[PDB]
Design a protein around this ligand. Structure first.
Ligand code: ZN
Lengths: 143, 92
DNA sequence: TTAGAGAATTGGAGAGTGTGTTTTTTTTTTTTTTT
DNA sequence: ACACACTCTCCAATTCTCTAA
């Protein structure tokens, strides 16, 4: 494909859990102790108090580059927390013209999304005797 | 084997993309004026030849394009046949 | 005078190898037990 | 194992030289 489809998705998408009055686990709140390792991958609901909130900063999704000699553009998609930027124009036409041109990054055609990180903690009146309260890290993107 | 090297060659020049384009367009491209300086008009002549050289064969520096052209221009008989054909057309 | 056949010199493609990385105050705001 | 620094090697691109038409 010419470019990754993520580059032109102008929208965000989210799921809203089942109404408990129609009801399933996503409708039934869990305290931060009940979130065992069994739940990894699932959609759940959590009840608690927020302890701290970060301020908004951008995160990359698709990065855009320009090749100087052959005047051609290439894209890279980022999922992990870190990445290596590109540094060689591997395009077949550029290669067959033996044109070992240099790649440079561009903001004006890259795609970002808003990011924020928070932390949630269990209610003090639900802590069992002699224990210290536990907490979870929450991530938030889009609108 | 390693990948063979890519070069300028008379086949590119004799292609329709090549030298016929210059003869098809040069009369319309360049324009001198007494109304502008020597340096002005002199600079103007090189524009078209530079852009054409890039479009033909982007490997190398402009000077290297000219000096490369000298070798094949003096040696290849088919290219020389084409050139005497031009000057015969004017003898026509 | 052109050109084509053979020899010598050089460039860098690219393949290979070894390597490094995780990890006693001194000054100032606040709670607590001690005279 | 994953980017780097450095070493080694082979192969063909190039220019130079000699010969004859
Ligand atoms: Zn390129």
């Amino acid at each position: 494909e010419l470019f990754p489809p993520n580059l032109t998705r102008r929208y965000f998408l989210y799921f809203k859990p089942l109404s408990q009055n129609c009801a399933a686990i996503s409708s039934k709140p869990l305290s931060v102790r009940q979130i065992k390792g069994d739940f990894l991958g699932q959609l759940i609901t959590v009840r608690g108090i927020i302890t701290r909130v970060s301020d908004v900063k951008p995160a990359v999704e698709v990065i855009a580059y320009t090749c100087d000699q052959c005047g051609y553009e290439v894209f890279q998609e980022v999922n992990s927390r870190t990445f290596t930027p590109l540094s060689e124009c591997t395009s077949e036409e550029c290669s067959q013209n033996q044109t070992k041109g240099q790649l440079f990054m561009s903001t004006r055609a890259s795609k970002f999304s808003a990011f924020q990180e928070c932390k949630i903690q269990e209610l003090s009146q639900q802590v069992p005797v002699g224990h210290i309260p536990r907490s979870l890290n929450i991530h938030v993107n889009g609108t | 084997k390693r990948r063979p090297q890519v070069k300028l060659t008379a086949e590119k020049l004799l292609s329709d993309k090549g030298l016929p384009y210059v003869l098809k367009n040069a009369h319309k491209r360049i324009r001198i004026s007494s109304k502008k300086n020597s340096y002005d008009n002199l600079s103007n002549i090189i524009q078209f030849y530079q852009l054409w050289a890039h479009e033909l064969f982007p490997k190398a520096k402009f000077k290297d394009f000219m000096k490369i052209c000298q070798t094949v221009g003096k040696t290849d008989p088919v290219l020389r046949e084409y050139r005497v054909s031009l000057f015969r057309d004017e003898m026509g």
